[PDB]
Amino acid sequence: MRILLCSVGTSWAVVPEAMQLLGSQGFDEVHVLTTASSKISPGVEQLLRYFEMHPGPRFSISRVQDFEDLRSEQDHMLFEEVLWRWLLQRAPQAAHRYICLAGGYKTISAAMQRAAALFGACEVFHVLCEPRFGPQGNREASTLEEVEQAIATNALRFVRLGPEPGWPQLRLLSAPSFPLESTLQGPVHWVRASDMRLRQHVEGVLERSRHILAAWEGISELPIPALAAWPPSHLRWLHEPLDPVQDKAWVQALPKVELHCHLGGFATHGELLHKVRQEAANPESLPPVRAIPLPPGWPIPEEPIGLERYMRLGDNNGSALLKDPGCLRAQCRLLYEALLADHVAYAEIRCSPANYASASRSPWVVLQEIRNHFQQAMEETPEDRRCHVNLLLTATREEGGDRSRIARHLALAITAAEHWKNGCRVVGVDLAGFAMFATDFEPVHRVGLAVTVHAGENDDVEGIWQAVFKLSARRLGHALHLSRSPDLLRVVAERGIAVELCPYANLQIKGFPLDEEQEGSETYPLRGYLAAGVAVTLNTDNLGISQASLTDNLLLTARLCPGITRLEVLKTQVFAAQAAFANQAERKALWARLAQVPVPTDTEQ
Amino acid sequence: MRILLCSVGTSWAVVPEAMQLLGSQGFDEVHVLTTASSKISPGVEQLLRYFEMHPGPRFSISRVQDFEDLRSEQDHMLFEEVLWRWLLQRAPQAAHRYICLAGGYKTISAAMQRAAALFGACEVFHVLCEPRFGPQGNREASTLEEVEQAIATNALRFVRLGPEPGWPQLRLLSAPSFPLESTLQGPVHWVRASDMRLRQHVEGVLERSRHILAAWEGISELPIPALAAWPPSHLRWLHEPLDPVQDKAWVQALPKVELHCHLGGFATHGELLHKVRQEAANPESLPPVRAIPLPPGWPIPEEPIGLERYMRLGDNNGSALLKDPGCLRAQCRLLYEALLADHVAYAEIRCSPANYASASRSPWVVLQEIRNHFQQAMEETPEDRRCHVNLLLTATREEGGDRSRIARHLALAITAAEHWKNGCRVVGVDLAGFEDRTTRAAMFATDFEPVHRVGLAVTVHAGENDDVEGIWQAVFKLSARRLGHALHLSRSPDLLRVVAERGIAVELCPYANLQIKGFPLDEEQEGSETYPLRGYLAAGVAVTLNTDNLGISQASLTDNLLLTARLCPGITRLEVLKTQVFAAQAAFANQAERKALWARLAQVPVPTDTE
Numbered sequence A: 001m002r003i004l005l006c007s008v009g010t011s012w013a014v015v016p017e018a019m020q021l022l023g024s025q026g027f028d029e030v031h032v033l034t035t036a037s038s039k040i041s042p043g044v045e046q047l048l049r050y051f052e053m054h055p056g057p058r059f060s061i062s063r064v065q066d067f068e069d070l071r072s073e074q075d076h077m078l079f080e081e082v083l084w085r086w087l088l089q090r091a092p093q094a095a096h097r098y099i100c101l102a103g104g105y106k107t108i109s110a111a112m113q114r115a116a117a118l119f120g121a122c123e124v125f126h127v128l129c130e131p132r133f134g135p136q137g138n139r140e141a142s143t144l145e146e147v148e149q150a151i152a153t154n155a156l157r158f159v160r161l162g163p164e165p166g167w168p169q170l171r172l173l174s175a176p177s178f179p180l181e182s183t184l185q186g187p188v189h190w191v192r193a194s195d196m197r198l199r200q201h202v203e204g205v206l207e208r209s210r211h212i213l214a215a216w217e218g219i220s221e222l223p224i225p226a227l228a229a230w231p232p233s234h235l236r237w238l239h240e241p242l243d244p245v246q247d248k249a250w251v252q253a254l255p256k257v258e259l260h261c262h263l264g265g266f267a268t269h270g271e272l273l274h275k276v277r278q279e280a281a282n283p284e285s286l287p288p289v290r291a292i293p294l295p296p297g298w299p300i301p302e303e304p305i306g307l308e309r310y311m312r313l314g315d316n317n318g319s320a321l322l323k324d325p326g327c328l329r330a331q332c333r334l335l336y337e338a339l340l341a342d343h344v345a346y347a348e349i350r351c352s353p354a355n356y357a358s359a360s361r362s363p364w365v366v367l368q369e370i371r372n373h374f375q376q377a378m379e380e381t382p383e384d385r386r387c388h389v390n391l392l393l394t395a396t397r398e399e400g401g402d403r404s405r406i407a408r409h410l411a412l413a414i415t416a417a418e419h420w421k422n423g424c425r426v427v428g429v430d431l432a433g434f435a436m437f438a439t440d441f442e443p444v445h446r447v448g449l450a451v452t453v454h455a456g457e458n459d460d461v462e463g464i465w466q467a468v469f470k471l472s473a474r475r476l477g478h479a480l481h482l483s484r485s486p487d488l489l490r491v492v493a494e495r496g497i498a499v500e501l502c503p504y505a506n507l508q509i510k511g512f513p514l515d516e517e518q519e520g521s522e523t524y525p526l527r528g529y530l531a532a533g534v535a536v537t538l539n540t541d542n543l544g545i546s547q548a549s550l551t552d553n554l555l556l557t558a559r560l561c562p563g564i565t566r567l568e569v570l571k572t573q574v575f576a577a578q579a580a581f582a583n584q585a586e587r588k589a590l591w592a593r594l595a596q597v598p599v600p601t602d603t604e605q
Numbered sequence B: 001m002r003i004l005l006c007s008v009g010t011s012w013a014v015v016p017e018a019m020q021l022l023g024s025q026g027f028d029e030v031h032v033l034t035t036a037s038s039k040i041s042p043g044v045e046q047l048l049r050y051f052e053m054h055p056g057p058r059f060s061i062s063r064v065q066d067f068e069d070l071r072s073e074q075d076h077m078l079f080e081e082v083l084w085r086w087l088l089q090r091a092p093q094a095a096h097r098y099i100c101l102a103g104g105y106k107t108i109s110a111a112m113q114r115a116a117a118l119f120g121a122c123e124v125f126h127v128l129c130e131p132r133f134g135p136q137g138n139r140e141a142s143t144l145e146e147v148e149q150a151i152a153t154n155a156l157r158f159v160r161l162g163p164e165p166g167w168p169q170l171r172l173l174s175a176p177s178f179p180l181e182s183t184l185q186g187p188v189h190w191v192r193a194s195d196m197r198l199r200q201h202v203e204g205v206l207e208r209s210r211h212i213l214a215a216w217e218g219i220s221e222l223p224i225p226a227l228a229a230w231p232p233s234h235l236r237w238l239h240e241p242l243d244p245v246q247d248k249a250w251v252q253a254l255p256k257v258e259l260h261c262h263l264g265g266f267a268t269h270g271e272l273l274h275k276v277r278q279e280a281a282n283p284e285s286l287p288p289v290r291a292i293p294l295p296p297g298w299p300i301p302e303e304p305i306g307l308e309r310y311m312r313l314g315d316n317n318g319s320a321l322l323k324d325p326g327c328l329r330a331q332c333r334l335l336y337e338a339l340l341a342d343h344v345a346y347a348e349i350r351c352s353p354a355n356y357a358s359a360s361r362s363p364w365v366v367l368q369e370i371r372n373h374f375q376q377a378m379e380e381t382p383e384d385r386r387c388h389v390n391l392l393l394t395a396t397r398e399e400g401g402d403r404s405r406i407a408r409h410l411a412l413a414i415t416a417a418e419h420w421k422n423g424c425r426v427v428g429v430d431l432a433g434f435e436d437r438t439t440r441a442a443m444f445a446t447d448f449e450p451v452h453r454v455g456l457a458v459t460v461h462a463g464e465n466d467d468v469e470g471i472w473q474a475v476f477k478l479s480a481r482r483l484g485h486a487l488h489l490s491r492s493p494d495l496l497r498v499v500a501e502r503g504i505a506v507e508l509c510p511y512a513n514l515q516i517k518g519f520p521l522d523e524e525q526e527g528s529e530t531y532p533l534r535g536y537l538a539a540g541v542a543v544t545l546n547t548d549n550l551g552i553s554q555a556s557l558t559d560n561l562l563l564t565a566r567l568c569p570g571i572t573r574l575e576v577l578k579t580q581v582f583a584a585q586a587a588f589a590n591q592a593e594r595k596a597l598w599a600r601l602a603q604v605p606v607p608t609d610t611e
């Protein structure tokens, strides 16, 4: 099929000249666009007469209803939009599209050529006729007889511009999406354009394409491929040092990934604890709220408080309260609600069912209660904002305690792994007790559960070594002293063993220099880990005891580690996403969620 | 800095009027684009007089030497080429590029606009003149006095087409790269186009950009991010099944990766064996070349021959010959040549230095000689074709309990790991850990504790019947980071998931597996005994394709790759590329070697057919 589209100005003979472009083969369909000016009407009648005879191919004539003459740029946009829609409707297939720029204003020809290039056409040409017509033999043919004489005299010279590929994202635009109004009055189609949507869409597509092309070169220093579409100015802003104050709003909206969160350390004090206590099912076994004053300077302690004091800080919650089913469900729902506030797109809550199991509530019942509460809280949230939650069972050894709880927790995890396969699942076991525990963990690996190793109040480099190799771990928690063995900072980096760093937890437990101008020997080891290839993440540890969320941790990473580029923050998020204990469906959903990185709003300095 | 570029035609009053778009501001310099037609010479003289009587900003006139008048399309392409080059020479920066396209023909203005959009322009504007001039008071300005009175009377209604930001790969071009030759004739510069290299440059840039944008949506599915510049037809081609017959050349052209290539079976038979033998430093000490008839149909046996027989096929070479330094050097040089002839961008040759020791030659000396031979071979090759080769030491689990060689190999590996830090290096060990319920993978007994202690890697050789227990004992007790011939992995649905999650690569050898275990060939669908390549790939495992023993298997890396299309029905080309990328990513290289390998991998050879 061949459809020929041309615009006619003051001369109507252009269409007949182009009619014989390919010769006797002809064009199956011909469409002509013309202005509404009265001076064009005589040409319209002449062309109607010329079309009645030579009635071989189908014919139709289109006039721009709202355009008469070129007077300014507004009519410019008007006829540009009208021409775009007219060509879209009349030539749905680019391969069958032939266009001639002889007719219309010079700007009309330029705009039509631009439209062809942007949307594609089979061929573009301009028809020039010998001016051996009319009186004195010095004018172009302007009558039916003159046009016919020109056609049979081989006097038409065709300037074929060759194929025009079109544009990738704009080769599919169709008239139905951007319909054009046509009013029929005789044999002439009167065309009017409703809105400017198409031009705005084209401009946006072109701007996005140019941004993508500009950023295409460095497609490996961007953690997320979707960052390519970002404007070059935004990308340059991205690599600058992270400012803890001006970036609070942006870092608030990042879809984050929380991999180290304790369920028992969420509402240890404050209004959250009061809510948990009020939602209790049996408001008679609740222990008195013990007074546990916070250290001065909280949440930024003046000096470290050691691990033991840190744990003792949250003594109003946990096992000594969560044994009431109402309190447990209230705690779970409040934790999920707090997760939804920071736009956390994925989390792995760490819970210990045994600490909450009573005589009449076996640990399996408590774990099922928690899992189903979380599955509920997920199911009352739209998937476009849902925060998937997977559970980790903390199997912590007791200093002088009983291994019976460890057996309880390993068996519970092994059973929960197989029981559930959709929604909130049990992904792995956390070892908040690491020393070797080798044969105690052979069953866990045999069924394929992940294991994370929880380092706490420690300064040893053999614990980190035996975690990696004896009880094969896939994530190390709080391993702040790992460069002290240059042999292991090269196996953790080569085996992809993620290191979960908690800024506030590690600062409050131990304390590090803050907002230092230059890195020294006491600064936070985050950047040293990053530059060595380590998959270092950032988390919150205990949301309650630490008294701050993931956003605060990411923001204070700047003060703790000087000169950290927010691109490093995105790298940490991607590392967490790659380190999570997800499966194909959850992993794909998480990755689709991460691609929506919020745009900056103060990239002007 | 503000500049103006405009072509001129039969109406010479166009450039003067256009020069007042900024009005009283003026422009730093305006250049005139002109053709060789003689109908515009009076206009050129009028413009020269106007410039002389209106001094200040620099002025120039350029006439198209080869374009006298518009007759055919060739003049049009020449005009566009001249426009592009002249704009580059006079408008290297688009921030000061202002365009007025009043002059010329209809196609001249369209070419002006296309060039402006392609290379960007700060302002593109057109001039409309109110007809009030001439003797009849109806024509437009055509003389110097008419131009001046039109300017003063304000008969100009300029139109601004908007800014042209440009094109990312075409806004950085500089004039000197594509110089413009011009002949001076008084005040008018006579430009000339040396060639149309610029047009081809622009066309290539636009085509590559179109390919990038078309395949952009879905770059996460491309094994190599550099494939986004491939034509969409080629991207469709990649997603089709592989063909063993037509795809010989394309596979031969891939920059591949080798990870399972034993040095003791490279020249076990034939011309290579003779080349090795005649290189011995002690020709009279060479063991007699025995008779080792190959089974019929080799390298495609009509029935499986067994691991014992397969191993025995390599008697002519190995410990029999390689004790001689000359034979060792010949082996190394020929192996490197065989690698280069197959376009391998990274290899890990596993040797057994202790097996080649003598009374006067300690295992360390043999290892040093091998490493230095490979380093020399690497040094003489241009860096574009240099196949970075690392070494893996083999701790064979020979029956009987002999641990002298195993201990020696582990100690030698721990020593070489630090002795060398550039070029060819020792990167790990490849514990065989045989099957017979007495060695398995629990042979650890602290034997492999030191190798882990120093940061070395381990790669097991799951034998000819390990049965899921070996593949677990090795993964979870030896901390193996690769597994060889893990063909029964599908048995336990838990191992096929632990391997996928932990990212443990699986090394497969199509030809060796076919010749030893035997598999259905040329099948239409996938049955119980179908080769597990596609099964492993589906589950997410990181499967890699290698050669095992070059000499014994008598098939190079390309032969192994093409045999998958016969072993695994429906295997596609994109999956071959995915296997190459997995092999590259699962190798024991460091940052420098990995970066070189990744730079070498991006150069995928374009298909010869496309359909």
Ligand SMILES: Nc1ncnc2c1ncn2[C@@H]1O[C@H](COP(=O)(O)OP(=O)(O)OP(=O)(O)O)[C@@H](O)[C@H]1O
Binding pocket: A262, A263, A264, A265, A310, A311, A314, A315, A317, A318, A319, A320, A350, A351, A352, A355, A394, A396, A432, A454, A456, A505, A541, A542
């Ligand atoms: N920040 C922390 N780092 C390491 N271990 C912690 C931390 N906070 C608590 N733990 C220990 O981890 C295990 C689980 O703690 P969780 O936060 O779930 O509270 P819990 O067990 O209910 O608290 P409690 O110590 O008051 O009985 C317990 O052994 C707890 O002592």
Ligand SMILES: Nc1ncnc2c1ncn2[C@@H]1O[C@H](COP(=O)(O)OP(=O)(O)OP(=O)(O)O)[C@@H](O)[C@H]1O
Binding pocket: B262, B263, B264, B265, B311, B314, B315, B317, B318, B319, B320, B350, B351, B352, B355, B394, B396, B432, B461, B512, B548, B549
């Ligand atoms: N496909 C294979 N499967 C298992 N073991 C193998 C295989 N190929 C070689 N081996 C064993 O691994 C080692 C191979 O190393 P290499 O060939 O360099 O030494 P070699 O002593 O010269 O070998 P060979 O006995 O083959 O001549 C030898 O122990 C060989 O027995």
Ligand SMILES: [Zn+2]
Binding pocket: A260, A262, A454, A541, A542
């Ligand atoms: Zn913790």
Ligand SMILES: [Zn+2]
Binding pocket: B260, B262, B461, B484, B548
């Ligand atoms: Zn092997």
